[PDB]
């Protein structure tokens, strides 16, 4: 009836097979690839499809999934959702040319959500505390909901314009207990918002980027989504057969979104993207790009060349950038905490913050030669506020062993003079 | 005839046994290991040519290789090459007293040289862009030849002397499009005579290192040696035993090139 051969090709056949040491097969091997569901990876074939069962499957199970090998082809606008590990150092992606979906690496049940009318908040803004320079929140002292967690607040006064919409009162920090703040508030606030707590691992994931083949020339709005993640460590990648113009388009690789206590690693792009409208003027194009983050390191990035800026920030806290090379470093919506740059190459972009914290600099080379693009300056310094949010930087910036190299003649021909070491100013008062 | 246990001992075997998880043994298990290939691992026997077989059939399938205990004598000139990922952490390499031969960590068709009469040496000769303190090599604009990838470049004009010996032109650099490299030249060259070109890999290596015995005091020039390489992470490594002397002998451990 029921034969050997039969019952090992089945579901429990490792469970049969001892080992020296002890145990069984079964118990050694806990992990799954993705040639555990037949997926054909000689790029003939779309698996949009065979890809997204295999991550319902280990999610279901709460396994990791390891694959060193192969090339597959994608297309659509999947979204492949990831609650562990990801290891996949060794495998292509290609995509089609419509290709719109991403990897959606998240964690489960991490995030709370308080409305204006929750009874949180409405203890919080009947108690004091929420002055400037303010470390404790007095409404928060004899409660314990919100201990241990990364809280990303709003509030609701105007703090200033840009582009002609109000911009309103923020704050990134960490509570322990007891109503105390990791990070004090720079500004007063007359009442809170909204409120979103996030849970810190009881474990570290880790995640090895696959390569993105890119000869198709695809334009997302992020292939990599990291959002609502804490402790995690994010390593390798890479872009190949990027074509050199990018026509009315706008491709972004990495986003992340309400992420904590994080380290990201040896992502290399051999050159940033070079997109234009239909005019031949340059459009905005990132390879990372994050918002509402606090507490991360960036180590070893490599996005150096002609083209957009290569990295995009909004509403951060506490950002360290070592060892790095890229041609760019920004901020649009204002930072706080501090922002570091140590042992960093730049390219002729230089550093573009507004900021309501202290910017530090430390072994840093800035690279100004711009000959690619025609005369094309948005800011006239090599260190600058955000021309369209004012011009402010409330905060010191401190300067050790800065190394200037390259002219920036391409800018100097067109306005005829060459650039500033420091600009802020506004494009309109308006 | 085609029995079950015959079978389950061939190289069809763990594809005919399911994990619950889901797939098969096979699907899980990608490694080649030292043990794989029955190699003496008490120090009683000279294992010099079956390490090389084993590294042959890795490079082959494209596989990686780990052991993690073991100790092996070596012996001879035996050039081991590997293309991927090695892990040696926690086995113990025993060189006989002759011993010069070395572990060959390459990546597999990642370099390419130009010579003097090649055309993209000739176009940069032909225009400008080759003075102190440049940026850019103006005979590469138009040019997508050596886009993403290292230069070693050597010149026609002497620098200095060293023990009587003329030494030329040179520098190292990165070239990511249109001709813009990432370091300006310090000093301007009247013409360039050779390009080494190596491109990035598309992966990151992994080479943990093993522990080297030098009782018998072997004295090659270099045990580990990393050529035309990128994108690689180097850990681990020791050496125990070492002599207090080493008359008449220079002893190098790690080569890099």
Redesign the interface.
């Known amino acids: 009836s029921k034969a050997?051969?039969v019952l090992?090709?089945?579901?429990?056949?490792?469970?049969r097979?001892g080992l020296k040491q002890g145990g069984t097969?079964?118990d050694a091997?806990?992990?799954?690839?993705f040639?555990?569901?037949d997926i054909v990876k000689d790029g003939s074939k779309d698996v949009t499809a065979d890809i997204m069962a295999a991550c319902v499957?280990a999610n279901d199970?709460g396994?990791d999934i390891k694959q060193?090998?192969g090339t597959y082809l994608v297309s659509g606008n999947p979204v492949w959702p990831v609650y562990n590990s990801l290891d996949l150092?060794?495998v292509?992606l290609k995509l089609a040319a419509g290709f719109t979906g991403y990897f959606a690496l998240t964690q489960k049940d991490s995030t709370t959500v308080y409305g204006p009318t929750s009874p949180i908040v409405q203890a919080i803004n009947a108690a004091g505390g929420r002055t400037a320079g303010s470390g404790v929140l007095e409404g928060l002292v004899n409660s314990t909901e919100l201990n241990g967690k990364f809280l990303f607040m709003e509030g609701a006064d105007v703090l200033y314009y840009s582009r002609g919409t109000a911009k309103y009162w923020w704050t990134n920090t960490y509570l322990s207990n007891r109503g105390k703040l990791s990070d004090n508030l720079k500004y007063g606030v007359s009442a809170i918002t909204k409120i979103t707590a996030v849970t810190p691992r009881t474990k570290i994931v880790y995640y090895r980027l696959p390569?993105l083949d890119f000869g198709n020339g695809p334009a997302n709005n992020g292939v990599i989504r990291v959002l609502n993640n804490t402790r995690f460590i994010m390593?390798?990648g890479?872009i190949?057969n990027r074509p050199?113009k990018d026509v009315s388009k706008s491709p972004v690789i990495i986003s992340l979104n309400y992420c904590a206590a994080f380290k990201a690693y040896?992502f290399?792009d051999?050159?940033p993207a070079f997109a234009v409208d239909s005019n031949n003027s340059l459009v905005y194009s990132y390879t990372l790009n994050f918002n509402d983050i606090a507490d991360a390191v960036f180590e070893n990035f490599n996005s150096?060349?002609?083209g957009w800026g290569v990295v995009g920030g909004q509403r951060s806290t506490n950002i360290t950038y070592r060892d790095c090379?890229l041609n760019r470093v920004d901020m649009h919506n204002p930072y706080m905490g501090y922002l570091k740059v140590l042992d960093t190459?730049l390219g002729t972009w230089g550093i573009n913050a507004s900021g309501m914290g202290d910017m530090y600099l430390e072994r840093v080379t800035v690279?100004l030669?711009d000959?690619?693009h025609g005369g094309h300056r948005e800011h006239e310094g090599i260190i600058n506020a955000r021309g369209d949010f004012g011009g402010f930087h409330d905060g010191g910036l401190y300067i050790k062993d800065l190394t200037i190299?390259?002219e920036a003649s391409a800018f100097e021909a067109t306005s005829g003079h060459p650039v500033a070491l420091v600009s802020a100013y506004s494009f309109n008062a308006s």
């Open positions: 050997l051969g090992l090709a089945g579901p429990s056949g490792a469970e097979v097969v079964q091997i806990n992990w799954l690839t040639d555990s569901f499957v199970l396994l060193n090998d150092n060794g292509t390569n390593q390798g890479s190949s050199l040896d290399f051999p050159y150096q060349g002609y090379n190459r690279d030669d000959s690619a190299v390259g």
